[PDB]
Amino acid sequence: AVKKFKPYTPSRRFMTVADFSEITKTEPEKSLVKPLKKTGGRNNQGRITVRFRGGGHKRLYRIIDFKRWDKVGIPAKVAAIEYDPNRSARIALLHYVDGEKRYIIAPDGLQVGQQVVAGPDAPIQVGNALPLRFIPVGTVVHAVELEPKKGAKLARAAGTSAQIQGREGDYVILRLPSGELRKVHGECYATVGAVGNADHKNIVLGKAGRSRWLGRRPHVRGAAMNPVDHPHGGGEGRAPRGRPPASPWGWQTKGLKTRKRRKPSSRFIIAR
Amino acid sequence: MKRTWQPNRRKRAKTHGFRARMRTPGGRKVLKRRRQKGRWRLTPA
RNA sequence: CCUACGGGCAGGCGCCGAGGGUAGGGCCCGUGACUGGGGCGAAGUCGUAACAAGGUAGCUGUACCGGAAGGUGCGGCUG
RNA sequence: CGCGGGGUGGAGCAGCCCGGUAGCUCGUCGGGCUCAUAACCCGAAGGUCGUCGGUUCAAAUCCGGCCCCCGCAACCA
RNA sequence: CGUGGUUCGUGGAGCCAUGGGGGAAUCUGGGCGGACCACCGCCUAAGGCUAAGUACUCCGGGUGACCGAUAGCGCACCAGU
RNA sequence: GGCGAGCUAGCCCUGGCCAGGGUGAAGCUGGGGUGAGACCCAGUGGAGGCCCGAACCGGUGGGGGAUGCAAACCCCUCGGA
RNA sequence: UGCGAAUGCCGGCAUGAGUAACGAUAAAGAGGGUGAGAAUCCCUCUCGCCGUAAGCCCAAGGGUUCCUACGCAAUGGUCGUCAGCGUAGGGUUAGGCGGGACCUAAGGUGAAGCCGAAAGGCGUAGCCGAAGGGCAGCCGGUUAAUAUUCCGGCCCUUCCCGCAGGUGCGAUGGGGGGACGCUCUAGGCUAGGGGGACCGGAGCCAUGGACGAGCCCGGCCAGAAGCGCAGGGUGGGAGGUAGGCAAAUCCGCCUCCCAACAAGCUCUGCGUGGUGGGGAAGCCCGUACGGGUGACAACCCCCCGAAGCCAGGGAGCCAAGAAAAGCCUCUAAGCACAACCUGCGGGAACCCGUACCGCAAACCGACACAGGUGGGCGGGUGCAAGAGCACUCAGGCGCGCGGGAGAACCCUCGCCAAGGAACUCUGCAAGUUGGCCCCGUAACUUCGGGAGAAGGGGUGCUCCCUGGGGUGAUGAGCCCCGGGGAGCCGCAGUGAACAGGCUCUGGCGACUGUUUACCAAAAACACAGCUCUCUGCGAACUCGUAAGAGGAGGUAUAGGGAGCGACGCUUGCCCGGUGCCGGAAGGUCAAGGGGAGGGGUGCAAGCCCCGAACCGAAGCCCCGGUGAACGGCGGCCGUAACUAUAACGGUCCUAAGGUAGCGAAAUUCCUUGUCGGGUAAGUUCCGACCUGCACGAAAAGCGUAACGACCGGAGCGCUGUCUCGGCGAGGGACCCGGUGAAAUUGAACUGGCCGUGAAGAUGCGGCCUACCCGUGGCAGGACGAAAAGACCCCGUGGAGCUUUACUGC
RNA sequence: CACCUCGAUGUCGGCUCGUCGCAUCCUGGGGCUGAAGAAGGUCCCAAGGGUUGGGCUGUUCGCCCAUUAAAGCGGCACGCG
Ligand SMILES: [Mg+2]
Ligand SMILES: [Mg+2]
Ligand SMILES: [Mg+2]
Ligand SMILES: [Mg+2]
Ligand SMILES: [Mg+2]
Ligand SMILES: [Mg+2]
Ligand SMILES: [Mg+2]
Ligand SMILES: [Mg+2]
Ligand SMILES: [Mg+2]
Ligand SMILES: [Mg+2]
Ligand SMILES: [Mg+2]
Ligand SMILES: [Mg+2]
Ligand SMILES: [Mg+2]
Ligand SMILES: [Mg+2]
Ligand SMILES: [Mg+2]
Ligand SMILES: [Mg+2]
Ligand SMILES: [Mg+2]
Ligand SMILES: [Mg+2]
Ligand SMILES: [Mg+2]
Ligand SMILES: [Mg+2]
Ligand SMILES: [Mg+2]
Ligand SMILES: [Mg+2]
Ligand SMILES: [Mg+2]
Ligand SMILES: [Mg+2]
Ligand SMILES: [Mg+2]
Ligand SMILES: [Mg+2]
Ligand SMILES: [Mg+2]
Ligand SMILES: [Mg+2]
Ligand SMILES: [Mg+2]
Ligand SMILES: [Mg+2]
Ligand SMILES: [Mg+2]
Ligand SMILES: [Mg+2]
Ligand SMILES: [Mg+2]
Ligand SMILES: [Mg+2]
Ligand SMILES: [Mg+2]
Ligand SMILES: [Mg+2]
Ligand SMILES: [Mg+2]
Ligand SMILES: [Mg+2]
Ligand SMILES: [Mg+2]
Ligand SMILES: [Mg+2]
Ligand SMILES: [Mg+2]
Ligand SMILES: [Mg+2]
Ligand SMILES: [Mg+2]
Ligand SMILES: [Mg+2]
Ligand SMILES: [Mg+2]
Ligand SMILES: [Mg+2]
Ligand SMILES: [Mg+2]
Ligand SMILES: [Mg+2]
Ligand SMILES: [Mg+2]
Ligand SMILES: [Mg+2]
Ligand SMILES: [Mg+2]
Ligand SMILES: [Mg+2]
Ligand SMILES: [Mg+2]
Ligand SMILES: [Mg+2]
Ligand SMILES: [Mg+2]
Ligand SMILES: [Mg+2]
Ligand SMILES: [Mg+2]
Ligand SMILES: [Mg+2]
Ligand SMILES: [Mg+2]
Ligand SMILES: [Mg+2]
Ligand SMILES: [Mg+2]
Ligand SMILES: [Mg+2]
Ligand SMILES: [Mg+2]
Ligand SMILES: [Mg+2]
Ligand SMILES: [Mg+2]
Ligand SMILES: [Mg+2]
Ligand SMILES: [Mg+2]
Ligand SMILES: [Mg+2]
Ligand SMILES: [Mg+2]
Ligand SMILES: [Mg+2]
Ligand SMILES: [Mg+2]
Ligand SMILES: [Mg+2]
Ligand SMILES: [Mg+2]
Ligand SMILES: [Mg+2]
Ligand SMILES: [Mg+2]
Ligand SMILES: [Mg+2]
Ligand SMILES: [Mg+2]
Ligand SMILES: [Mg+2]
Ligand SMILES: [Mg+2]
Ligand SMILES: [Mg+2]
Ligand SMILES: [Mg+2]
Ligand SMILES: [Mg+2]
Ligand SMILES: [Mg+2]
Ligand SMILES: [Mg+2]
Ligand SMILES: [Mg+2]
Ligand SMILES: [Mg+2]
Ligand SMILES: [Mg+2]
Ligand SMILES: [Mg+2]
Ligand SMILES: [Mg+2]
Ligand SMILES: [Mg+2]
Ligand SMILES: [Mg+2]
Ligand SMILES: [Mg+2]
Ligand SMILES: [Mg+2]
Ligand SMILES: [Mg+2]
Ligand SMILES: [Mg+2]
Ligand SMILES: [Mg+2]
Ligand SMILES: [Mg+2]
Ligand SMILES: [Mg+2]
Ligand SMILES: [Mg+2]
Ligand SMILES: [Mg+2]
Ligand SMILES: [Mg+2]
Ligand SMILES: [Mg+2]
Ligand SMILES: [Mg+2]
Ligand SMILES: [Mg+2]
Ligand SMILES: [Mg+2]
Ligand SMILES: [Mg+2]
Ligand SMILES: [Mg+2]
Ligand SMILES: [Mg+2]
Ligand SMILES: [Mg+2]
Ligand SMILES: [Mg+2]
Ligand SMILES: [Mg+2]
Ligand SMILES: [Mg+2]
Ligand SMILES: [Mg+2]
Ligand SMILES: [Mg+2]
Ligand SMILES: [Mg+2]
Ligand SMILES: [Mg+2]
Ligand SMILES: [Mg+2]
Ligand SMILES: [Mg+2]
Ligand SMILES: [Mg+2]
Ligand SMILES: [Mg+2]
Ligand SMILES: [Mg+2]
Ligand SMILES: [Mg+2]
Ligand SMILES: [Mg+2]
Ligand SMILES: [Mg+2]
Ligand SMILES: [Mg+2]
Ligand SMILES: [Mg+2]
Ligand SMILES: [Mg+2]
Ligand SMILES: [Mg+2]
Ligand SMILES: [Mg+2]
Ligand SMILES: [Mg+2]
Ligand SMILES: [Mg+2]
Ligand SMILES: [Mg+2]
Ligand SMILES: [Mg+2]
Ligand SMILES: [Mg+2]
Ligand SMILES: [Mg+2]
Ligand SMILES: [Mg+2]
Ligand SMILES: [Mg+2]
Ligand SMILES: [Mg+2]
Ligand SMILES: [Mg+2]
Ligand SMILES: [Mg+2]
Ligand SMILES: [Mg+2]
Ligand SMILES: [Mg+2]
Ligand SMILES: [Mg+2]
Ligand SMILES: [Mg+2]
Ligand SMILES: [Mg+2]
Ligand SMILES: [Mg+2]
Ligand SMILES: [Mg+2]
Ligand SMILES: [Mg+2]
Ligand SMILES: [Mg+2]
Ligand SMILES: [Mg+2]
Ligand SMILES: [Mg+2]
Ligand SMILES: [Mg+2]
Ligand SMILES: [Mg+2]
Ligand SMILES: [Mg+2]
Ligand SMILES: [Mg+2]
Ligand SMILES: [Mg+2]
Ligand SMILES: [Mg+2]
Ligand SMILES: [Mg+2]
Ligand SMILES: [Mg+2]
Ligand SMILES: [Mg+2]
Ligand SMILES: [Mg+2]
Ligand SMILES: [Mg+2]
Ligand SMILES: [Mg+2]
Ligand SMILES: [Mg+2]
Ligand SMILES: [Mg+2]
Ligand SMILES: [Mg+2]
Ligand SMILES: [Mg+2]
Ligand SMILES: [Mg+2]
Ligand SMILES: [Mg+2]
Ligand SMILES: [Mg+2]
Ligand SMILES: [Mg+2]
Ligand SMILES: [Mg+2]
Ligand SMILES: [Mg+2]
Ligand SMILES: [Mg+2]
Ligand SMILES: [Mg+2]
Ligand SMILES: [Mg+2]
Ligand SMILES: [Mg+2]
Ligand SMILES: [Mg+2]
Ligand SMILES: [Mg+2]
Ligand SMILES: [Mg+2]
Ligand SMILES: [Mg+2]
Ligand SMILES: [Mg+2]
Ligand SMILES: [Mg+2]
Ligand SMILES: [Mg+2]
Ligand SMILES: [Mg+2]
Ligand SMILES: [Mg+2]
Ligand SMILES: [Mg+2]
Ligand SMILES: [Mg+2]
Ligand SMILES: [Mg+2]
Ligand SMILES: [Mg+2]
Ligand SMILES: [Mg+2]
Ligand SMILES: [Mg+2]
Ligand SMILES: [Mg+2]
Ligand SMILES: [Mg+2]
Ligand SMILES: [Mg+2]
Ligand SMILES: [Mg+2]
Ligand SMILES: [Mg+2]
Ligand SMILES: [Mg+2]
Ligand SMILES: [Mg+2]
Ligand SMILES: [Mg+2]
Ligand SMILES: [Mg+2]
Ligand SMILES: [Mg+2]
Ligand SMILES: [Mg+2]
Ligand SMILES: [Mg+2]
Ligand SMILES: [Mg+2]
Ligand SMILES: [Mg+2]
Ligand SMILES: [Mg+2]
Ligand SMILES: [Mg+2]
Ligand SMILES: [Mg+2]
Ligand SMILES: [Mg+2]
Ligand SMILES: [Mg+2]
Ligand SMILES: [Mg+2]
Ligand SMILES: [Mg+2]
C-alpha cells in the first residue's frame, strides 16, 4: 500500500507511488466497452475558463456503468480489476451471463471471481446494487444516485462512501462523504460497500513534473502579480493582503459562503 | 534571427483568401471597399 | 691500476635506506571574546514550596506553564 | 528650524474644553490588632499647579513669551 | 408602473409612442382642446394604398471675373498602378 | 467599425529528435540469519525532473562591434542536455 | 495677390572628401587561350580551405533563376570578354513517386434543433480537414537541359467483359481487425565498413636501396516462382444462449471434448535464384564536359556491423498511452436464369505536380547581408568511446577590389628576466588545472551523498613469455579484453588537437526547472508539501446578452479560490475596530397594502388629487463567533549590606501589551557600536555581546545535508592584473591604381593673453603673437554632434494603478 | 540670490596627463629664543625641484602598517567620460 523510493535523487526522496497489486492481470484496457477517445481540452469555445490546465499524459476513456438497474436480475462475474486513469478509484470488469461486458467502479473488498448483481432482490453484499429503500439501515454504500434513474453521482472518489442513517417517507437519510446529512429518494440505486483504493490520499507527487503528468500547470499566487490582474498584486516588495483575501475576480475567498440560497434542493439537506 | 514573415501558401489563402473574406460580414465589406477603390487585386495573390 | 689474468681493485648502475619535503587524517594537552551550570562564602532581595491535612496529603515518571520556589494534566507509589 | 501633545502634594494619574470647587491610588505621620513584622482596621497631615507677563471682579483653567518633556516630520536632491 | 418623442432636463406635464400589471364600451359609444372638474367646442383610434411638388449625381450634356502639370481629381502620361 | 497569433504567449491534433561515456535504486536469484522473521552479504538487474559531454535548446562573464556583417551580430567562456 | 526663416513642404545641387568603407585573416602563384580592352572569363599546372561539410538527397518557400546562342548600358561594392544580368530559342513526359475521383484527427462546417435588436452565436448526424491510417516499381541506359515519368530488362494494382470452377449470395447495419505509451532489450539479418598471401588490371623501379608473397587500382547491383534461413500473426470441434438497440450460423458468455504446440496454417524480412546491368587506376582524345582503351576485366574468401529489417518481437514501469476506412466475418431487405468467391484470358486505367535554388547570391532578414530555416545520408585513420578532435576521400570551395609599405595607435594572437594580486569596486581578464588507468580521499549527512573531495603515481616505442573471449571445426586465420618480463630514445610519451584550478567559511533560495524577445537570470516566479475557505452536483467557480460551454463525461481521497513553500523543531496573547459566519426576537427600512382625515370642481349623483395609523424584504443597527481572517501586541517611578544592576514593588492606560527563537542582521539611525578572530596593517568578513532608531513565528520563526553561471570573506596554486614595460605575428591604420558614402553645415577672410560683454569671446577693447597651402597624429575649446531634458516646475494637458474620494454600471 | 544654459552646459570616485597659486611639507638663506652642544620653538626670505609603497572602504576624507629629506595645502566647469 504505497511504494517508497530511496533518495537516489532529490524528490525521489519524498516521491511515493500507488500500489498496483489489486490490478488483476491488466495493461490493455478492454476496447469495446470503452475506451472512447477522450477530448483533452482545457478551455471552452476559445477562452480558458479554468486556469493552469493542459499537457500531461494522453488518456483513453473508460465508459463506465453508473446505472446498474440497467440489468436488474442478471448476475455477473467479476472478471478483472484494472487501472482507470480518468478517476481516483479503480474499475472492475464485469462479465454478465448475458455475455455483456461493463466496467463498474470497484468497491473495497471486491475480489475477482465473485458473482455480483443488482435489483430489489440482491443479497446485501459488497458489489451489489439495489434501490436505497431495500438496503439495511446502517450499511455503508457507494456510487449513489441522487434522483431515481439519473445515474450514480455520490461517493465515487477513491476511499469514499455514504452511510444510511434512517428512512422517512419516500426518502432515506444519507450521511455523505462531506459529512452532510442528505435526504435521497428511496428508489435511488446505491451499491453496498465503500469505494476502495483508499490509500490514494497518501501518495506524494514528489516533484513538479509529477503534477505536470496529471495535467496540472503551475499555479501562480495573486501576490506575485500586479494590480492590473489580481487584487493581491503590487507592493514593494512582499506584502500582506491589505484587504480581505480575494480571488482574481474580486470576491472574498475566506469563509464567504457561495451556495445559492433559494435553491429548491435546500429542503432536502441538513449539515456541513 | 527568426523574422516575422514565414510564408505559407495555405495559411495565406485560409486567412486572406477570397472565400474566407466572404464568410464574415466584415470581410464582405473589405471586398466592397477594394472593389470600389478599383484595386486590381481584391485578395492577396 | 695490480697479477700469483678465465682474478682483484678503482670506477659505474640498481635495491633498501637516516632523514628532509608535499598532502590528508587520528588521539592528547594548553589557551580563547563569550557563554553554561556547580561548589563555597557571620548577619542582602523576593516570596512559603517541604517538615504537624504544613494549612491544596506527599512523593513520583512524563508533559505543558510560570520571577522564583513551584502549579496543573495523565498515570503510578504510601513512605 | 516644522507640526502635535504635555509640565498639578514624595511617586504615578485626573481636574484645564465649560474661569469661582484642586480629586484618585500609593506613599508619609499618629493610633489600633500581634510576643513581633507585614497584611489588615481607625485617624490625620502634605500641592500654587514649570516660569515670566497679559485678560478678567476672579486664572491650575483663557492669551502670549521663555524653559524643558514626549511623539511625528525633514521629500524631488 | 418603467421609458422614448415634442421647445418640455419631473416640471402645474398634457399630447404621441409603449416594455410590465390591470382591463371596457359601439353614437346616449370614444379620443382631444397642457394637471383636475364643469361648460363649450374639435375629431372619430386600435386594417391598407395613394401620383405630383422633395433629396442625390455613378452617368450624359451646357456653361464659368474655376485650375493650368508643386495647380486641378491621388491619376492630363496604361494609377488606385 | 474593422484587420491581425505566418512574430511572440498558452493550449489542442498528428509526427519527428536526443553521439558516446559514467553512477548502479527497486526487484529477482543465491548464501547467511530466525521458531518464523526483520535484516545482512554476493551476483544479477538497469531505476533517475541522477552525473560527464556533442547534436539540439540556451544566453553566464569578458572582449569586439556602435553611419555594424547584424534595427541583438561575432569571438572566447558558460547553463541544460 | 507679394516669403528668408515655421527642426516648414516637394525638388535640385552643395559641404564633410577623393575622406570611412568595398561585408568574415580559408590564400594565393604562374603558364596558355580569348579579346578593342583581362589580377577578375576559359584551360593546365602548383598552393591553400571545408569534409556530421562549406559534400549529397528530400520538405517548405521562391517561380525561369534551368540548358543554349548572341550581348555588356544598367544590376555585380573593383574589373568583366563573365553572371543568378539584357535579347532570343529550347527544356519539366508517371495506372506503380506525391496529392486528388480513399479514411478519419484537432478544429472547421453543419439537415435536426436551441439562442440572439439586425449583423449573427451555438449545435447531434453528416460533411470538410493530414507529415497520421490505407494504397501496386526495382535496377540500368539515354538528353545541352526530364526521368522510379522516356527506354531496356524483370515485376505488380485496380476497373470492365468473358470463360470455367466454388458458395446462399447480398450493407451505410452487427462483430473482428486496423489499434498504438515510456525505458531497457534477445535472436537472426541487411545497409555500411576493414583486411586478404586469393582473383582481374593498364603501367611504375626514380634519389641511396627494392623485380618484390612489391607499388598503384578494382574485386559488385537488380531479379519473379520455387527453395532455404530467421521472425511475426493464429488454437480446433460440439452443445446452450435471454447480450452486441432488426437479423445473424458472426462476436460475447457457459458447458463438454480434443490440441497446447507456433505442430499446422498464414504473412513478412533476408539469402538464393531464369535473366538482365554495371564494371578502377593509368594511358589516349580537344573539350567549355565528356568520350575511347583498360575488357571476354575480375566480380571470391575472412572480419567488424547498426539507432535500420523480421515488427503487432520480449521484459520492466506508471504518468496508463487517436480515430476512421481499406480488410475479414455476420446476417437484413432483395435477389436467388441473380450475385459474390477463385483461377485464366482479353480489354480499360483520368486530373495536378515533376525545370532550377534549397543552411542559401535563387527561402525569411530593403543588400550577391558573418543572422535565421525542418527531415535523411554523411566514407577513412588515430585518439578509451563518439555525430567529439586533427588530418583526409568523394565532392565543393579560396568567401566579386587589388598592388605595395613595415609609423603611431586599434583589434586578434605568441613570448617574457626578478617579483607574484603589490592590480582593481572584484584576480575583471588571462593564466593554472585538464583525457584514460591506478592508489587514495575529511567535516558533515536526510546514509543517497559530500566524491572527480583533497593529494598523488602511471601514460611512448622494442623484443620475449603468457590468460580469456568472439567467429570459425574444438583448429588456423581475422577481431576483441588483457597480464608478466627485459630493454630503447628525447627536455618532454593523453609529445599535435578536443578535455575541471583547488580549498576553507558566511548570506539567500530546499532541490531540476521559469522570467523582463532587444541593458536585470536573481535572494524574483514555479515547485512537491502545510493550512484556511468555498462546493451535494443542473456543484462552486469561469466565458457568454442568450443558447451554450469549460468544470467533468469528474462527485468531497473530487473541484474552485487564498496564503505559505523540501525537510526538522515550532508557530504564542488580543475578537474592542474592519471582514466573514451564526442569530425565527427587537429597532430602523422601499415599492405595495391600508386607508383615519383633507382638498379641487359639479345643482347633485359623481369625477379627480392629497393623505395619518397600521401591516410590508434585503440591508443596516443590535446580540454572539471567528487569527495559516484585515490586523494589533505599552508608559513613568522606585527598590538588594561597596558600587552597579534590579529578581521585587507603585501607579497610568489597553481589545491585548511581543512567547520561543533570533538579533549592529539582505533589518542598526548614532556606527568604522564594543570585544574576540583573520592581516605587518581589516568601514568589509567570521565569532560574540544586546543599547532590536525600526527582528519575531504560514507577507511564517529558527535551523538544515545536497544543490547554485546567485551575493560576501579568506587561503593554496598560477599568472602581463600589477612593479613596468619589452619584442614579435597577422587584419587594419599609411602610399599607389579602381569604386566611393555619412551625420553635420547662417555665412566665414575662424589666433594668444588680460579685460569687457546676458555673468565662460576666433567675431568687442588694449596689448601680444603670426609668411601662403597641406599631410600623419592627439583630443583642451568651438558652452562640439546626436535627441524640442527623460530630472524639476508649469498646463484648471494625458494615461496606468489605488481606495472606507464622488457618481454610476 | 535665481543672471547665461532645460530645441541638453553628462553628475561622485578612480585612472591618465598635467599646468598654475604660495597662505612652504622637504631641501636652500635668514632673525629672534626661555638657542650650552645636538635637537627644537616661532617668525622672515624663497615656488628650482621634490613631495613613497601598502591594509580598510565606491569613497573624497580619514584611521592603520612599513618607510621617508618630506609624505604640503589649494586653483584650473569641486581641471581632465
Ligand atoms: Mg470561433
Ligand atoms: Mg497529499
Ligand atoms: Mg504558487
Ligand atoms: Mg512583480
Ligand atoms: Mg492585460
Ligand atoms: Mg484591482
Ligand atoms: Mg496588496
Ligand atoms: Mg517591505
Ligand atoms: Mg530556433
Ligand atoms: Mg513581406
Ligand atoms: Mg518586413
Ligand atoms: Mg502546408
Ligand atoms: Mg447583405
Ligand atoms: Mg486590369
Ligand atoms: Mg597533523
Ligand atoms: Mg566559566
Ligand atoms: Mg559563573
Ligand atoms: Mg508551606
Ligand atoms: Mg505542595
Ligand atoms: Mg500542602
Ligand atoms: Mg504530609
Ligand atoms: Mg506531576
Ligand atoms: Mg520558561
Ligand atoms: Mg515576572
Ligand atoms: Mg494523580
Ligand atoms: Mg509629578
Ligand atoms: Mg469648568
Ligand atoms: Mg494610605
Ligand atoms: Mg501606621
Ligand atoms: Mg504658559
Ligand atoms: Mg500667571
Ligand atoms: Mg516622490
Ligand atoms: Mg416626457
Ligand atoms: Mg433639472
Ligand atoms: Mg428627452
Ligand atoms: Mg385631457
Ligand atoms: Mg400596456
Ligand atoms: Mg363617453
Ligand atoms: Mg384638440
Ligand atoms: Mg380636434
Ligand atoms: Mg381607417
Ligand atoms: Mg386609417
Ligand atoms: Mg409612396
Ligand atoms: Mg439643393
Ligand atoms: Mg457630370
Ligand atoms: Mg490658359
Ligand atoms: Mg510635373
Ligand atoms: Mg498633380
Ligand atoms: Mg512647366
Ligand atoms: Mg473623379
Ligand atoms: Mg499628386
Ligand atoms: Mg493610367
Ligand atoms: Mg503561431
Ligand atoms: Mg539528425
Ligand atoms: Mg526516445
Ligand atoms: Mg547509459
Ligand atoms: Mg536462506
Ligand atoms: Mg552490477
Ligand atoms: Mg541488488
Ligand atoms: Mg551492468
Ligand atoms: Mg539530467
Ligand atoms: Mg547539473
Ligand atoms: Mg558542468
Ligand atoms: Mg551536462
Ligand atoms: Mg553572449
Ligand atoms: Mg542577460
Ligand atoms: Mg561589449
Ligand atoms: Mg557585449
Ligand atoms: Mg563545458
Ligand atoms: Mg554547452
Ligand atoms: Mg522661396
Ligand atoms: Mg520674416
Ligand atoms: Mg578627415
Ligand atoms: Mg585617413
Ligand atoms: Mg581605407
Ligand atoms: Mg582579404
Ligand atoms: Mg569563377
Ligand atoms: Mg574544368
Ligand atoms: Mg515549390
Ligand atoms: Mg529573367
Ligand atoms: Mg546558367
Ligand atoms: Mg557567351
Ligand atoms: Mg555591364
Ligand atoms: Mg561594374
Ligand atoms: Mg554589394
Ligand atoms: Mg566585346
Ligand atoms: Mg539569361
Ligand atoms: Mg520522387
Ligand atoms: Mg494516389
Ligand atoms: Mg471516374
Ligand atoms: Mg476527400
Ligand atoms: Mg471524410
Ligand atoms: Mg437569422
Ligand atoms: Mg458554426
Ligand atoms: Mg462540432
Ligand atoms: Mg501517408
Ligand atoms: Mg501501420
Ligand atoms: Mg501511391
Ligand atoms: Mg535511373
Ligand atoms: Mg539537372
Ligand atoms: Mg519503364
Ligand atoms: Mg458459373
Ligand atoms: Mg435464408
Ligand atoms: Mg466496423
Ligand atoms: Mg539486435
Ligand atoms: Mg548491398
Ligand atoms: Mg557487406
Ligand atoms: Mg595480381
Ligand atoms: Mg592485357
Ligand atoms: Mg637508385
Ligand atoms: Mg613482378
Ligand atoms: Mg586491394
Ligand atoms: Mg576489398
Ligand atoms: Mg556493395
Ligand atoms: Mg539477390
Ligand atoms: Mg474454444
Ligand atoms: Mg456460439
Ligand atoms: Mg438480436
Ligand atoms: Mg467459428
Ligand atoms: Mg516459422
Ligand atoms: Mg530477394
Ligand atoms: Mg524469393
Ligand atoms: Mg550475369
Ligand atoms: Mg556483362
Ligand atoms: Mg568505362
Ligand atoms: Mg555554355
Ligand atoms: Mg510489444
Ligand atoms: Mg464513413
Ligand atoms: Mg455470408
Ligand atoms: Mg485481368
Ligand atoms: Mg523531374
Ligand atoms: Mg530535379
Ligand atoms: Mg540540389
Ligand atoms: Mg547556418
Ligand atoms: Mg545549421
Ligand atoms: Mg540540413
Ligand atoms: Mg551548397
Ligand atoms: Mg547558388
Ligand atoms: Mg559576396
Ligand atoms: Mg548569408
Ligand atoms: Mg537575401
Ligand atoms: Mg547566435
Ligand atoms: Mg557513421
Ligand atoms: Mg570519423
Ligand atoms: Mg599511438
Ligand atoms: Mg577520445
Ligand atoms: Mg568537427
Ligand atoms: Mg578534390
Ligand atoms: Mg580572389
Ligand atoms: Mg569580399
Ligand atoms: Mg602557445
Ligand atoms: Mg614575467
Ligand atoms: Mg620566470
Ligand atoms: Mg607562489
Ligand atoms: Mg592600490
Ligand atoms: Mg589591494
Ligand atoms: Mg563585481
Ligand atoms: Mg572578492
Ligand atoms: Mg576569471
Ligand atoms: Mg606559458
Ligand atoms: Mg580553462
Ligand atoms: Mg578508489
Ligand atoms: Mg559515494
Ligand atoms: Mg560544504
Ligand atoms: Mg584527482
Ligand atoms: Mg595526474
Ligand atoms: Mg617514440
Ligand atoms: Mg576461443
Ligand atoms: Mg556476426
Ligand atoms: Mg581462434
Ligand atoms: Mg609489459
Ligand atoms: Mg619517462
Ligand atoms: Mg573536465
Ligand atoms: Mg547564522
Ligand atoms: Mg533557486
Ligand atoms: Mg523555456
Ligand atoms: Mg528565454
Ligand atoms: Mg532582458
Ligand atoms: Mg524590455
Ligand atoms: Mg458540462
Ligand atoms: Mg465532460
Ligand atoms: Mg482545496
Ligand atoms: Mg514566498
Ligand atoms: Mg521562507
Ligand atoms: Mg500567529
Ligand atoms: Mg495577557
Ligand atoms: Mg480583534
Ligand atoms: Mg467579537
Ligand atoms: Mg469582529
Ligand atoms: Mg449577518
Ligand atoms: Mg425583526
Ligand atoms: Mg405606502
Ligand atoms: Mg392606497
Ligand atoms: Mg364631493
Ligand atoms: Mg415597521
Ligand atoms: Mg458594525
Ligand atoms: Mg444575550
Ligand atoms: Mg544599591
Ligand atoms: Mg559587611
Ligand atoms: Mg538594611
Ligand atoms: Mg514589574
Ligand atoms: Mg517589536
Ligand atoms: Mg525575547
Ligand atoms: Mg544565542
Ligand atoms: Mg560589526
Ligand atoms: Mg530594523
Ligand atoms: Mg590581531
Ligand atoms: Mg576587529
Ligand atoms: Mg561591500
Ligand atoms: Mg531617529
Ligand atoms: Mg519579517
Ligand atoms: Mg512584521
Ligand atoms: Mg503572520
Ligand SMILES: [Mg+2]
Ligand atoms: Mg536564518
Ligand SMILES: [Mg+2]
Ligand atoms: Mg538552476
Ligand SMILES: [Mg+2]
Ligand atoms: Mg545561479
Ligand SMILES: [Mg+2]
Ligand atoms: Mg588580501
Ligand SMILES: [Mg+2]
Ligand atoms: Mg600587457
Ligand SMILES: [Mg+2]
Ligand atoms: Mg603587424
Ligand SMILES: [Mg+2]
Ligand atoms: Mg584610393
Ligand SMILES: [Mg+2]
Ligand atoms: Mg594656421
Ligand SMILES: [Mg+2]
Ligand atoms: Mg573672457
Ligand SMILES: [Mg+2]
Ligand atoms: Mg567696438
Ligand SMILES: [Mg+2]
Ligand atoms: Mg580680440
Ligand SMILES: [Mg+2]
Ligand atoms: Mg596649416
Ligand SMILES: [Mg+2]
Ligand atoms: Mg591635420
Ligand SMILES: [Mg+2]
Ligand atoms: Mg577637441
Ligand SMILES: [Mg+2]
Ligand atoms: Mg579619435
Ligand SMILES: [Mg+2]
Ligand atoms: Mg551639445
